[model samples]
Target chain A: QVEGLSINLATIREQCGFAEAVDICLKHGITAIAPWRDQVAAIGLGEAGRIVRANGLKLTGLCRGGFFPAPDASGREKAIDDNRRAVDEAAELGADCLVLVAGGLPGGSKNIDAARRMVVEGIAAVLPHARAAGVPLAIEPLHPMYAADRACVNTLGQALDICETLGPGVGVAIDVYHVWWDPDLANQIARAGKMKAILAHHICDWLVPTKDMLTDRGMMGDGVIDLKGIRRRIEAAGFHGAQEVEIFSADNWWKRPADEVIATCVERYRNCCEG
Target chain B: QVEGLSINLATIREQCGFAEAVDICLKHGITAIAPWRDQVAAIGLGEAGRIVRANGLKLTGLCRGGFFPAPDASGREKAIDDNRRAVDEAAELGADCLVLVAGGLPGGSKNIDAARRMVVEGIAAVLPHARAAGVPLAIEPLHPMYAADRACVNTLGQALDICETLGPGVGVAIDVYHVWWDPDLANQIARAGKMKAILAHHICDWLVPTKDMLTDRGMMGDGVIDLKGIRRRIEAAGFHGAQEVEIFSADNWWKRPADEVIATCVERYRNCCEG
Candidate 1:
C-alpha cells in the first residue's frame, strides 16, 4: 500500500544528510524520492546519482531550477547558466522532471508582473536545452504568500498558462501545501490533467495555528487540509505519480530521528491517504 | 496634503494605548482613524467612541467582525452575536463600515469550501442588523497564508463573491499587505469598483524576507509592494477614501516609541502614497 510514496529530502534535512536520508528511505522500503540540490551537492552529485542508480531508487524530481530574476544582466546570465547545470544533473539522474521554484522579485524591484515575465522567459530560454537533454521541466507554483520573494507563479492556472505556451515538455508539480487554499483548485487540476501537465504531486498539511509560515507544515491529517479528498481529485485528474511527502517542519518533526519521521509518513500515508 | 489619511491603531499599536494613539494622530492633524475592537475594548468602547466624537474624527473603519466559524452551532451562534455587537459598535463610532476578518476553518474541519459557505451565511446573519444600523460591512480579504486560522476569505474575487451574494452594505477592505501578491489584484479592484464594494483602503508593504506572517509587515516604502501604483489603481476604480495605515509589527515597529511610530507612518503615508 505504501509502495509508491516519495520523500522530499527537506523533510529530514535536520536529522539526516543526503546519503543517510537515502539509506533511511531504502530501509523503510520507500524507493522514490526528490532530493534538494544542496543535498546532492553535499555528498557530490555523482555520488548521489550513483547511490540512486545503484539502489534503483526513483528520482520523482530533482529539487529545483529557475530563480530567473536578478539584479543585473550578469546576475541573470548566472542564474540561467545555473539552471542549465540543473538540467544536466536532472538528465543524468533521470528525474521524472526538473522542478522549478521560479524566483521572486529581482533585487530592489517591486514589479512582480515583471518578475513573472522573467520567469516565463527564463523557462523559454531553458526549454530547448531541457528538450534536447530529454528532460521535462515542471513548474512548481508555490503559495501566493511566496509570490514576492520565493516564486511569482502562484496558482495552477498560472502555471498551466505557461505550459500552454511552452509545449509538451513543460508541466506542473502540484503541491497541496501551496494550493489547498485555492478556490480554483479543482478546475485548475482538471485543466492541468487535460494538458497532461501534472508532473509531480507533493503532499503536506496546513497547520491550524501555523506559527511560522515556511516551516510549520503539519503531517497529513494533523492539520485542516482534506488530504484524502484532494488525493482523490488528483487521481481523477490523471496524476498517477507517488504522493511525495514534503513536510517542512522545523520545530517538530525535524528534531526527531529520521526513522521516526519516515515511519510517521508511512502511517499517515496509509491511514490518512487510504480514505 | 494629508486630507484623507486614517491611522488604523495597530500601525502604532506598539507605541501607545487607545487614547494616546488618538492623541498622537491628533497632533499630526490626522483627524481620521480606525480602531480594532480590542483597542476599543481596552479603553472601553464608550470611552473610545466618545473620544472619536469629541475630536470629530472620521472613522474609516472599525477593525473587525467575522470570526463566524466555530466547533459547534452554539459557538457559531456566539460568533454571530458578537459580530452583531461589532456592527453596533461601528454604528456608535460613526465608522464608514465594519471591517470583517472572516474566520478560518472551524475546529477540526477540513472543508474550506464549507467554511466559505459558513462565512457567507455568517455575513448574511449580520447583514440585516448592519443595514438597519446604517453600517456597511467590509470583508477584509487577508493573504492566503492566513486562510486556515485567520481568514478563509483570501482574495478580492472571493470577498466580492460574498459581497455579490450578500448584496449592498457588504463590501471589501483593500489592504495592500494582504493582497499585493495577487496577480488578479488590479482586475479584482476594478471588479470591486464595478460592484461599488470598495469600502476601505489599507496601506502597508509585503516584506521580502517576511520573518513572521502575522507581524512582519513592512512600512510602505520598505518592502516590495508598489504602494503608489496600487493607490493609482484604487483611485481610478472610484475609491477615494482615507488610506488607513495598519501594520502588525511585534519585533520591529512595535518596539519603537509611539511618537516614532506615528512619525514614520505619517512620513511613509506622504512619501509612498503619491498618486
Candidate 2:
C-alpha cells in the first residue's frame, strides 16, 4: 500500500519520463503519485489518464495551475483560460486537488500587493470552472525566497486567508520545506484545520547552506526539518492524505537512479516522516 | 551629509580592514557605519573606538552579538559571555545599538522551538549586561531562508514579540533585504512603531535569480525589491535612522575596489534608495 506515502514525480524527474517514473513508484509499492503538468503533457493526456485508470493509481494532486498575476488584463485572462484547462486535466486525472503555485511579481514590477490581488481575482475567476469539474484548488504557499519569481503566496496563513476569502472549492497545500521556518506554523496549521482548508501535505528537507534556490532540496532525514513533528500537526489537523515526497535536488538525488530514489523516499517516509 | 545612509563594513570586507573601511566611507561623505566584531577585534577595541570617536562616525550598530543557541549549556554560556564582551565593545565604540543575529538550530537538532527557547534564555541572560553597558540589543530577524542555519527568529513580528517580552533595551534592526517579501510587513512595521522598538534600518536589494544564499546580495536598484516603498513604510513607522548598506556580494561588489563600492553606495542611496 506504501502506507500513506506519495511520490511527487519531480523527485526523479531528471531521470525518468511520466510512465517510467510512475512505474518506478509502483515498483516500490507506492500507489499514490503527484505528477507535474509538463510531465502529463509530455505523455499525452489521454495516455496518461489511461495509465492511471489501468493501474488504479491514486493521484495525490495535479501539480499545479495558478500563475494568475500578469502585467495586463488580457494576460490575466489568458492565465485563467490556462487554469481552466488545468482544472479539466486534474478532473480527468481524478486528482485530489489542483496545486496552485501563485506566481510572483509580474512584468518587472515590485508591487506584490497588486500581484496578490491579481492572484485572488484570478483564483476567484476560475473557481466556478474548478467546482463544476469536481476539482479542488489547493493554493501552495511557496517559500518567501521565491516571492519575487516563483510564488508570492509565501505563508500557509496567507494561503488560508485567501481560501477563507474565496470560499468553498479552495484550500491550501502545506509544504513543510516552505512553511516550516514560520514561527506561527502551529497556530496557522490549527487555523487551516478549523477552516477546512488543508488540501495537500508536501514533504522535503531544507538543506543547511542550501546551494541553489530552485533545486537544492534535501531528502526527508537529510536536513534539519522536524518531519515527524510536522506530520503529527497535519494529522491532528484532520489531514489523512498521503504525505508527498517532493525533493528537487539537482546535484544530489536527481543524479541517482530512479529506483534508488524511489526506494530511499519510501524508506525515509517510513523511518523519518511517520509520527 | 550623506542623509540617513550608513555603510555596513561587510560590504567591503574583502577589500579593506576596520580603519580602511571607515576611511572609504568618509571619503564618500558617508559618516555612519556598522562594523563586525572580528573587524573591531582585528584593529583592537581601543583603537577602533579611537577611530570612531576621532572621525565622529555614527556607529549605527555593532554587527553583531547573538549565536546564543548551542548543543550544550556550557556552549550557550560561552556564547552569552562572548555577547557580553560584544556589549562592552559596542559601548566603548558608542554604537547606537548592538545587532543580534539570533542563532539557529543546535548541532544535530531539528527542534527549532527548543533552540528558539534557548535563544530567548541566552538573550535574557545577557540582557542585564547589555543594559549596563548601554547597548540596546537590536534583534535582526534574518530572511526565512536563514532560519534553519543562521537565525530561528525569522520574522519581524516574531522578533518584536521577543522584544515586547523582554521589555526595554531590546528592539529590532529592520533590513529590507530580509523582510521585503513579508505579507505582514506593513502591519508589523506599524506595530514596531507603536512599540517604539525600531533601532536601525539596513538596505539591500533582493536579486531575482539570487545566486548565493550567504553572499550574492544585490546593490540597490540591481534587484526587484521595492526599496523606496519599504523606506516609506519605515519612515511612517517613525524610524529616521541611517539606512545602512549591508551587502555580502561574493562575486560582484566584493570584487570591486572599496572606493568604487563606497561611491556606488552613495550614488545608489541618493538615486535609488531615498524616498
Candidate 3:
C-alpha cells in the first residue's frame, strides 16, 4: 500500500485544478499532495481545506512562499506581505511547511548578492508572522538557471546557511531536480539531518536534453538521476516525509489526463522511489 | 580605450568562421581572442594561425579540450588522446591555456562523482603532454545543469579543489555566466586568488528569461549578473588578463551581423566589463 508518497499537483497542473485532482488521487488510494497556491485559490482555500479534512488527506506543503527579491520598497514589502498570507493559507490547510522559492535579483538589479540580502531581510520580516501562524517556512532553493528570475537561494548548503543564521522555525526543501548535481549532497543531507532542518523531499528527474527551462522534467527512471540512492541519503538524513513527486512537464506529462498522471506517479514511485 | 578585452570566437560563431571572426574582432579594435578547435579546423589551422599572427592578436585561451567521461575504457582513452591533440593545437596557436569542460557522467550512468574522477584521470593522463608542450590546462566548471552531459565540475570551489589536487599548471576559467549564481562566490573567488588558480576570466550576462539552455546568453549589462562587481572581485584576486567576452546566443545575438555583435561587445566591455 502507498503509505508515504505525494504528488505535487504541478505534475498534472495542466489537467486538473484542485477538487478533481483530489478525487483522482483518492480513487487510486493516494491521500497526500503538495499544491500550488493558485490551484487552492481557484477552488477557494475554504473548499480545498474542507476537501482535505473530508478525505483525511495530508498536505506535504503549500506550493510556495518565497520570491522575496524585488526592484523597489513597494515590491519588497509586497512580497513580505504576500508571504504572510501564504503562511495563513498553509496554516489553514494544515500544511507541513510553507514551501519558499526565495526570489532571484530584483527587476533591474544585477547584484545577485544584494538580491540574496533582500531574501534574508524579507524572510526575517515575515518569520514572526509565520511562527504565530504555526506554519514552518521551508526554503526551496531553485536551480542556478533560475538565479536571475526565480530564486537566488540555489543550493541546499546555502539554504542551510541561511537557516543557521535565522535559527529555528526555518528549514530547507530538498528537491532532487535542483540539487542532485551538488558535489557535497551526501554531506549536506547528513548535516540537514544533524540540524533537524529536513523539511521536505521533492522528487523529479533532470532530463538530459531539457527542452524547456521552466517545464520539461523527465519522469523518474526515464532520466539519469540516481533516485533510489538519493532517496536513501535523504531518509538517512532523518526525513521520513512523503517522497513528493513534483514534475513541471508542460509539453509532455501535463497534457495527459489526470488519472493517467496519478497512476504513472504511483507506478514510478514504486519502481524508482525504492532504494 | 578597450585595450585589454578579448572576444571569444563563439561570440561571433553564428556570423563568421574562425578567420572571419578574427578579422571582425581586429576591425572592431579588439586585439585578443579565444577560438574553438572546430572553428579553427573549418578554416584550416594554417589559415586560422596566419590570421592571428598577421593581426598580432593574443590568444587568451583555447575554447575547450575536455570530454573525458565516456561509456567505455576505449572511449575514455580516445578522449584523453584527443585532449593531447587539443594541447598541440593550443600550442600551435600559442594560446595561454587550454580550457577544459570536464565531461559529465559516462553514457547511461548516473554516477556524477565517478564522472568527476574520470575527468581528473583524463586531465592527469594528458597533463604530461600539456606540460611538455608548455601549455597549461584551464578547467572551466560549467553550470550545474550541464552536470549530466557537459561537465560535472559546476563551481569555482570544485574547480579550485581540482587545481589543488593537480598542482601547478592547472587553473580555473571563471566564466560569469556559469559561476555568478554561486552563494559562496565571494569566498570562493578569494580562495581561488589565494591558491593562484584563476587562469581566465570569461564575461557574459545571465538572462532573466533564459530561453535556451545551451544558447540564449544575454549581452553584458543587458541581464541580471553583476559584471563590474565580478570583474572587481577577479581583479582583486590578482588576474589582469584580457576580460574575454563569450556569448552563445543562438536566437538573438547570433542572428545579428558579425560587425554589430562585435560592436556591441566593445561597447559592453567599456560600460560593464570595466571594474
The candidates' DockQ values read 0.74, 0.84, 0.83
TM-score for each of the candidates? 0.96, 0.99, 0.97
Model 3: per-residue lDDT, tens digit, B1-275?
36989889899887888877877787778899999999988899898888878876799999789999998889999999999999999999899999999988887898887888999999889999999999999999999888898899898888998889989889999999899999999999999899988889999988878888899888998887888898899889988889999999988888999899899998888888898
lDDT of 1 by residue, B139-217 (tens): 9998999898889999888899889987888999999988888878889999998999999999988887899878988
In terms of lDDT, the best-performing candidate is 2
lDDT of 2 by residue, B1-275 (tens): 68789999999999999989988888778899999999998999889988988988799999989999999999999999999998998999999999999998999899999999998998899999999889999999999999988999899999999999999999999998899999999999999999999999999999988998889899999999889998888889999888999999999999999999989999999999987
lDDT of each residue in A101-203, candidate 3, tens digit only: 9877776877788888999999899999999988889999788878888888999899999999998899999999999999888999999999999989999
Residue B274 miss distance in model 2 (angstroms): 1.6
What candidate 1 gets wrong by more than 4 Å, as runs, is none
> How would the docking of model 1 be graded?
medium
Q: By summed lDDT, which 10 consecutive residues of candidate 2 chain B come out lowest?
A: B21-30
Question: Best by DockQ, which number?
Answer: 2
A1-275 per-residue lDDT for model 2 (tens digits): 78899999999999998999988888789999999999999999999999999888999899989998899999999999999999999999999999999998999998999999999999999999999999999999999999998899999889999899889999999999899999999999999988888889999999887889889999999999999999999889999899999999989999998898889988899889997
C-alpha displacement of B214 in model 2, angstroms?
1.3
C-alpha local distance difference test of each model: 0.89, 0.93, 0.89
